[model samples]
Target: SGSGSWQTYVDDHLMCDIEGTGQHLTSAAIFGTDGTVWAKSASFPEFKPNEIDAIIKEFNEAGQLAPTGLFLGGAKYMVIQGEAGAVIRGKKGAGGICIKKTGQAMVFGIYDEPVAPGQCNMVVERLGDYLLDQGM
Candidate 1:
């Protein structure tokens, strides 16, 4: 179950995979409140449940403030709530994924040692700030 303001998943019987550091590349694709898709790229060691919460908090705050999340080693992406749509590209580092109204896309080389980037393909439809204001 994902919050309209954020995405949340929980399951006891769900399959899971754990990868070693510098081995597995992780990312999350979320659609924004604006309905525009934005992708981010970065390298982060698998985070614990607490860390994941913190990261999501940060991402939510970003959306509340302006609609941007710069997590995972320097990979950042932004979404402008409007008809102009959103813009997804490399920020400090490269390599990530994003699926726009058009389709899904991928990037590579976010880490110094052959790293894969983090990305989100969903658009910003509701805008976190607006949702929060409305208590969604």
Candidate 2:
């Protein structure tokens, strides 16, 4: 079975090959409650730490708190318009996938071009399914 730290899990499994509808993930992250990024996709301009925090806080304030299970469940995913792109948030048990047996969070950035919000949500939702299967 796949085994390693959460960073390795993200690097090995979650970073690439994320396809949803027509848009592909250009950048993404596995974030912690304190807004620390555990891992990110291969790309430029590695997101600043404080930026990650701001993003998560923005969504959390919007009511997209971490999920109880891998699935986001009744919690609505939050989408915020940005100056250059859009930010999408998915949480589970107060984060996206619990690691170290504690809650964690997730963030995705679409920078190539604008896409439908449904496409963004679907990608993260599928990610949740993957995490569930991996027992993350």
The CA lDDT of each predicted structure is 0.29, 0.43
Evaluate residue 110 in candidate 2 and report its C-alpha lDDT on the 0 to 100 scale: 38
Residue 79 of candidate 2: its Cα lDDT?
A: 32
lDDT per residue as tens, model 1, 6-30:
2221010001121334232344333
- lDDT per residue for candidate 2 within 58-92, as digits (tens), equals 44453332332112222333333222122333432
Cα distance off (Å), candidate 2, residue 126 = 2.0
Please, what's the RMSD in Å of model 2?
Answer: 10.7
- Model 1 scores a TM of 0.23
lDDT of 1: 0.29
